[PDB]
Amino acid sequence: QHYDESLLSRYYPESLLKSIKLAQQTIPEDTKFRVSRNVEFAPPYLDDFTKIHPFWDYKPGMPHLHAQEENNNFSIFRWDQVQQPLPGEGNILPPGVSLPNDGGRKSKSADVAAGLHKQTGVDPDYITRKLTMKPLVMKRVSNQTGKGKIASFYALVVVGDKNGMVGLGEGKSREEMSKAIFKAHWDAVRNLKEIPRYENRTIYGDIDFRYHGVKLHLRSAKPGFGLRVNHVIFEICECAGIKDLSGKVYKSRNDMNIAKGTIEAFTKAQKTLDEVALGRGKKLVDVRKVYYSS
Amino acid sequence: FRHLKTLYPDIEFVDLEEQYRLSMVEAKKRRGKGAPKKMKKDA
Amino acid sequence: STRPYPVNVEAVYYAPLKLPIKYGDLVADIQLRSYDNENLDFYSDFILRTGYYLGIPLTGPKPLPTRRERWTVIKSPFVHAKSKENFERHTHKRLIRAWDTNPEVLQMLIAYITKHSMAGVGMKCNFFQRSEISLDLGSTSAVGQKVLELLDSPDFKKHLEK
Amino acid sequence: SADLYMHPEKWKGLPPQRILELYWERMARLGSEYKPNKDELNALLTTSEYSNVPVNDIKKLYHRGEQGAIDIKGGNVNRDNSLRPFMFDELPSQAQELVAQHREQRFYNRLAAYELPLLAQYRQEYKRPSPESHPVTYRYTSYVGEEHPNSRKVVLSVKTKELGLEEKSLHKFRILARSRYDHTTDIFKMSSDKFEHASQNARYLHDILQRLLAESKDLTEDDFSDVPLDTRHTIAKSLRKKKRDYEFPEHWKRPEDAPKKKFDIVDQLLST
Amino acid sequence: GNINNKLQHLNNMNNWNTQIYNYNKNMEIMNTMNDKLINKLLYKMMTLKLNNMNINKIIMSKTINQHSLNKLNIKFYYYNNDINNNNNNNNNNYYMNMMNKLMNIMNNNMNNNLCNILSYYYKKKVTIEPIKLSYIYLNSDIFSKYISLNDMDKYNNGILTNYQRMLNNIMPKLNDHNISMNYINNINNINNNKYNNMINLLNNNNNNYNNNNNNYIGNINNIYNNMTIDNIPMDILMYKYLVGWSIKF
RNA sequence: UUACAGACUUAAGCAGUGGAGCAUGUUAUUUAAUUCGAUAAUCCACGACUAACCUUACCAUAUUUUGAAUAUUAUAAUAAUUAAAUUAUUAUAUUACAGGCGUUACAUUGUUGUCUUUAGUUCGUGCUGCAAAGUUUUAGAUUAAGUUCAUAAACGAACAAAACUCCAUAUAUAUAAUUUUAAUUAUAUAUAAUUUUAUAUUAUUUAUUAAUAUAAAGAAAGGAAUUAAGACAAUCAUAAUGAUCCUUAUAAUAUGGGUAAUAGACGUGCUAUAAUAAAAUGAUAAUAAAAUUAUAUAAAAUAUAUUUAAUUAUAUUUAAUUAA
Ligand SMILES: [K+]
Ligand SMILES: [K+]
Ligand SMILES: [K+]
Ligand SMILES: [K+]
Ligand SMILES: [K+]
Ligand SMILES: [Mg+2]
Ligand SMILES: [Mg+2]
Ligand SMILES: [Mg+2]
Ligand SMILES: [Mg+2]
Ligand SMILES: [Mg+2]
Ligand SMILES: [Mg+2]
Ligand SMILES: [Mg+2]
Ligand SMILES: [Mg+2]
Ligand SMILES: [Mg+2]
Ligand SMILES: [Mg+2]
Ligand SMILES: [Mg+2]
Ligand SMILES: [Mg+2]
Structure with a gap:
């Protein structure tokens, strides 16, 4: 289409009007333009080519194959910065990727909380605020292979909220011990269980439990007695919220099997007073508690 | 490269290939493996 | 009213326009050569656009037979195993012909396209000038000179004496 | 102005960035021939606020250089x-090559949109030389942007029957041209690249043409009418090119078997 | 599509460091030899010294010699780590560091610019365009030169456990498949935006006899509606993301 | 130590070759030199992109000595700069050196080679075992063969094959004012197949199946490149780095010679040992492709061998073309 100078003079710069006039006097209005399917001369988008883009066009004053300035008339005298910054926002960050501005600020508890929430539906806030994690066993194991000895880091950790909920987790990593602890912490939260506690301080009565080669003898204790038990049992009691306990481990004292045996004993070897009363159809009275009641 | 020290007096260029050779010469002098003094035709 | 896109900008998005040949007087042959076709074709398209505005009827780019050069490099084994790597170079050729144009306009075409040439493209131009049989004012080798000098030197004159 | 950078006296009053740009231009354009100037330092001190550089540092930096800055820094361990x-x-260097390709395309597109149209001012109407007064054709060759020995070569070609020679003189002309005349095409072609310049070679061919025509038109002594034209050179050339000189027999054509255009009402109705 | 667009493929001419064609083969051989020699010379001009203990090594890629009919453009990528004045001040705005002095003799120096010297060696106009790369892992040639020449104290007694770790955290591990599929979706969207534009411009009618020969669909604006420089170019550009890297010592 | 399958190889079949002369490489021997190229007992040291000079690395004789480089310090000749000194260039001289086909019994690195590996590792998660660990069906089916497809408390990613990609082939569009003509072509772009469907037969894991044949549609029938490791070879006269040795000589130049010697031996070729095969002749000229021509390709013609002429060889002359 051929347009009158008035219209074309309201959209295009004066410097380009002469070129438009000459083109409208050399190309007949009835020109049937054909599309080339061998050579693509124009870009894949529409452009009047009246403005120089700061990025998609050559930089004015910069030397290059098609620079029209004389060699003594270039205007780039500083070379410490990139001449043509990226267009638009200034970045090419892929959709769904984040610029790594900050590194080393992650909390492994928050990483465990986010992953478990997505995988199991547990509340992240409870994991990151209510739970305490204590490593119990940290050793290196090795497998003999044809290539050679392959070492691995083994971590056994216990987590708990100090209010009845405790869990045991194990983790392995061939790379570093920190990765093994992360997996163990992850596993421990998934294994969280509630343990009955008498007066939220001790166990119900005494427990004689056999876990593989470990013989566990645990006795309930008076208020203010403290934890007088194997060190492995001490850590578990701390996380679980057991304050008063006495006990002795016989036969095997393997730390790993003491920890698992203890967790199992607290669940499979205890019976609440309420559960005993309902099963037998009898009333069970705590004499010490009644003595100080109204 | 030898013409650069007069074309551009302001800039100080370093020839790493030449510099490497000169260090290897000094090293051999320190080990006693230097080059024999060349005989003079006058002799 | 939307922004008007004039015919000059629109032409860029379509195949280059060609002017009809009226008389058929071939005035120039422009042969372009490159080791790759992509710049060769793009530059050829630009020449057709330059000629159109200059009023030069142009034909082409006619593709001419591609020349293939080959080289075989025997490798270290030469044991009749994968012991001969092959290499090749292809010269791509294009011919653009100009018709019924005055010499001055033809020189403007060559000057402009020379100023805005692409990397790795070569250009040969054959100009054809029709002239009259009789013109006005029209349109010794080094070895021979030395031979005369040598034959005058005494080492040769001393024998030529008759 | 282009020469403003060479006149630091005239920088006073320019905006902060313009003065810094002119200071950078004088250093880049002069290089080792650069000598500190008071006027230049005076203008740079006026930019201590646009850059927030202490007015004292500017003076040191202006006289010391990179070493001065290293001292101001306090160390050289970054x-x-x-x-x-x-x-x-930033983009990878291979992606920066594809952007350069696109910068080139846009550069050419802009030339075609707004620069090529201006070439229409130089259009000249073809002043065709009459085919009868201008029968000779001089071919010149130009290798653009190259030094090539063949650029000197000039070729001259003409149809003998357009030379205005009588019958007897035309025969003598063709006899004396020998291998340079092709009877089949009637073309007399001679080329010369003996001289170093094309103009020299063009004159040389022109002079030979006049000499050949003069001898051919001087039939006072010999006309070489007894001597028949020798075409052996042309025959040898013809044997090296394949001749497809066979056409479909006319008595084999069956025009009655060609498809007959059918009647399409739609196209017949769409035309009215 | 991919090879018919300048933003979606690398021109084969770029596969060669000397981009030239001369009818005179001897002149082509000479130009090729001149490009190797100048490349070696430039490698020797990259090492600069301010003082005995301040040696700045600029890492330069191989040169791209673009030989056109009228000029020769020598394009190269360079990396420089500014270790002398890497501050937040604007002191660099009042002096020319050694790297700026070196870059300004390529074209700007009015008396002894390297371009004029080379213009006589090549007998043609010569321009030099230095292009700065900010990271050393954006160009394979620069990356190899840096390691080879500057990281020797890290791998001369085995590859340091920290050195290797840095060479493995350079880039976040982008998902190539998701990036590859995002690119293909954008192309389909652009391709379907132009087909819809024409289908609409045809169904709306923008000589019946001429309606069987010409293929002109209508105004350029309508055919390319919603296809501008602000959305098409950056989405189709290829080789935009580093997705893999293998280093060896 | 058992069993299984598949290899590479094997022999089988077919078509060529095995001795003679000569060409060429190696060995041995000879030689002033016949430059260099191999030593942990099967065999076996091979450079045909051109060794008269050059090449050249070897021998004889003669000759050169900071040499081809960079720098230092002097001396000059020269041009600028600066008020005669400075700086530039050049030459000469000076001394660190330069140079070295000297050294793998000169240590490492490259390079390329061969060589297995190439559906297997590592990682994430899940699951089993108190645990080291394992991740299970499965010692799956199928193909010439990861070939192709199934399947299991495993699932997925990366990895690489594969896909993909290019070439060829068929077709479409564009380009050529169809005398640069081969339009029966040239070369850009696009499409096509890793073919498809019905039917009968034989097997099957018998079903929505393979092997088969039958019918139909189709131009459709062949190739290329491709991972990372592991174990091993080569001096690369095809690039390095160090150490080590020569420095009036193990460096450099010239003339001539040698690498071309000849008892035996070996490899690889050429031409032959005649009639399913050799030799002549075949001009309106039976029928190609791929290349080459500015450090050129050389037409036709004439002359001589040489005879009517042709043929073959050379000379004379140097047409056209630096090229669809
Ligand atoms: K001889
Ligand atoms: K696992
Ligand atoms: K034809
Ligand atoms: K010899
Ligand atoms: K025979
Ligand atoms: Mg001639
Ligand atoms: Mg003949
Ligand atoms: Mg021919
Ligand atoms: Mg010799
Ligand atoms: Mg000799
Ligand atoms: Mg040495
Ligand atoms: Mg020697
Ligand atoms: Mg377990
Ligand atoms: Mg799996
Ligand atoms: Mg020999
Ligand atoms: Mg024939
Ligand atoms: Mg002849």
């Missing part, structure tokens, strides 16, 4: 950020 993490702010 962290080695050679393996720093990528901030998705």
Whole structure:
């Protein structure tokens, strides 16, 4: 289409009007333009080519194959910065990727909380605020292979909220011990269980439990007695919220099997007073508690 | 490269290939493996 | 009213326009050569656009037979195993012909396209000038000179004496 | 102005960035021939606020140079950020090559949109030389942007029957041209690249043409009418080119078997 | 599509460091030899010294010699780590560091610019375009030169456990498949935006006899509606993301 | 130590070759030199992109000595700069050196080679075992063969094959004012197949199946490149780095010679040992492709061998073309 100078003079710069006039006097209005399917001369988008883009066009004053300035008339005298910054926002960050501005600020508890929430539906806030994690066993194991000895880091950790909920987790990593602890912490939260506690301080009565080669003898204790038990049992009691306990481990004292045996004993070897009363159809009275009641 | 020290007096260029050779010469002098003094035709 | 896109900008998005040949007087042959076709074709398209505005009827780019050069490099084994790597170079050729144009306009075409040439493209131009049989004012080798000098030197004159 | 950078006296009153740009231009354009000037330093001190550089430092930096800055820094030990993490702010060099390709395309597109149309001012109407007064054709060759020995070559070609020679003189002309005449095409072609310049070679061929025509038109002594034209050279050339000189027999054509255009009402109705 | 667009493929001419064609083969051989020699010379001009203990090594890629009919453009990528004045001040705005002095003799120096010297060696106009790369892992040639020449104290007694770790955290591990599929979706969207534009411009009618020969669909604006420089170019550009890297010592 | 399958190889079949002369490489021997190229007992040291000079690395004789480089310090000749000194260039001289086909019994690195590996590792998660660990069906089916497809408390990613990609082939569009003509072509772009469907037969894991044949549609029938490791070879006269040795000589130049010697031996070729095969002749000229021509390709013609002429060889002359 051929347009009158008035219209074309309201959209295009004066410097380009002469070129438009000459083109409208050399190309007949009835020109049937054909599309080339061998050579693509124009870009894949529409452009009047009246403005120089700061990025998609050559930089004015910069030397290059098609620079029209004389060699003594270039205007780039500083070379410490990139001449043509990226267009638009200034970045090419892929959709769904984040610029790594900050590194080393992650909390492994928050990483465990986010992953478990997505995988199991547990509340992240409870994991990151209510739970305490204590490593119990940290050793290196090795497998003999044809290539050679392959070492691995083994971590056994216990987590708990100090209010009845405790869990045991194990983790392995061939790379570093920190990765093994992360997996163990992850596993421990998934294994969280509630343990009955008498007066939220001790166990119900005494427990004689056999876990593989470990013989566990645990006795309930008076208020203010403290934890007088194997060190492995001490850590578990701390996380679980057991304050008063006495006990002795016989036969095997393997730390790993003491920890698992203890967790199992607290669940499979205890019976609440309420559960005993309902099963037998009898009333069970705590004499010490009644003595100080109204 | 030898013409650069007069074309551009302001800039100080370093020839790493030449510099490497000169260090290897000094090293051999320190080990006693230097080059024999060349005989003079006058002799 | 939307922004008007004039015919000059629109032409860029379509195949280059060609002017009809009226008389058929071939005035120039422009042969372009490159080791790759992509710049060769793009530059050829630009020449057709330059000629159109200059009023030069142009034909082409006619593709001419591609020349293939080959080289075989025997490798270290030469044991009749994968012991001969092959290499090749292809010269791509294009011919653009100009018709019924005055010499001055033809020189403007060559000057402009020379100023805005692409990397790795070569250009040969054959100009054809029709002239009259009789013109006005029209349109010794080094070895021979030395031979005369040598034959005058005494080492040769001393024998030529008759 | 282009020469403003050479006149630091005239920088006073220019905006802060313009003065710095003119200071950078004088250093780049002069290089080792650069000598500190008071006027230049006076203008740079006026930019201590645009850059927030202490007015004292400017003076040292202007007289010391990089060493001065290293002293102001207090040390020369800057962290080695050679393996720093990528901030998705720059493009790979291979992607920068594809952007350069696109910068070139846009450069040519802009020329075709607004620069090529201006060439229409130089259009000249073809002043065709009459085919009868201008029968000779001089071919010149130009290798653009190259020094090539063949650029000197000039070729001259003409149809003998357009030379205005009588019958007897035309025969003598063709006899004396020998291998330079092709009877089949009637073309007399001679080329010369003996001289170093095309103009010299063009004159040389022109002079030979006049000499050949003069001898051919001087039939006072010999006309070489007894001597028949020798075409052996043309025959040898013809044997090296394949001749497809066979056409479909006319008595084999069956025009009655050609498809007959059918009647399409739609096209017949769409035309009215 | 990919090879018919300048933003979606690398021109084969770029596969060669000397981009030239001369009818005179001897002149082509000479130009090729001149490009290797100048490349070696430039490698020797990259090492600069301010003082005995301030040696700045600029890492330069191989040169791209673009030989056109009228000029020769020598394009190269360079990396420089500014270790002398890497501050937050604007003191660099009042002096020319050694790297700026070196870059300004390529074209700007009025008396002894390297371009004029080379213009006589090549007998043609010569321009030099230095292009700065900010990271050393954006060009394979620069990356190899840096390691080879500057990281020797890290791998001369085995590859340091920290050195290797840095060479493995350079880039976040982008998902190539998701990036590859995002690119293909954008192309389909752009391709379907132009087909819809024409289908609409045809169904709306923008000589019946001429309606069987010409293929002109209508105004350029309508055919390319919603296809501008602000959305098409950056989405189709290829080789935009580093997705893999293998280093060896 | 058992069993299984598949290899590479094997022999089988077919078509060529095995001795003679000569060409060429190696060995041995000879030689002033016949430059260099191999030593942990099967065999076996091979450079045909051109060794008269050059090449050249070897021998004889003669000759050169900071040499081809960079720098230092002097001396000059020269041009600028600066008020005669400075700086530039050049030459000469000076001394660190330069140079070295000297050294793998000169240590490492490259390079390329061969060589197995190439559906297997590592990682994430899940699951089993108190645990080291394992991740199970499965010692799956199928193909010439990861070939192709199934399947299991495993699932997925990366990895690489594969896909993909290019070439060829068929077709479409564009380009050529169809005398640069081969339009029966040239070369850009696009499409096509890793073919498809019905039917009968034989097997099957018998079903929505393979092997088969039958019918139909189709131009459709062949190739290329491709991972990372592991174990091993080569001096690369095809690039390095160090150490080590020569420095009036193990460096450099010239003339001539040698690498071309000849008892035996070996490899690889050429021409032959005649009639399913050799030799002549075949001009309106039976029928190609791929290349080459500015450090050129050389037409036709004439002359001589040489005879009517042709043929073959050379000379004379140097047409056209630096090229669809
Ligand atoms: K001889
Ligand atoms: K696992
Ligand atoms: K034809
Ligand atoms: K010899
Ligand atoms: K025979
Ligand atoms: Mg001639
Ligand atoms: Mg003949
Ligand atoms: Mg021919
Ligand atoms: Mg010799
Ligand atoms: Mg000799
Ligand atoms: Mg040495
Ligand atoms: Mg020697
Ligand atoms: Mg377990
Ligand atoms: Mg799996
Ligand atoms: Mg020999
Ligand atoms: Mg024939
Ligand atoms: Mg002849």
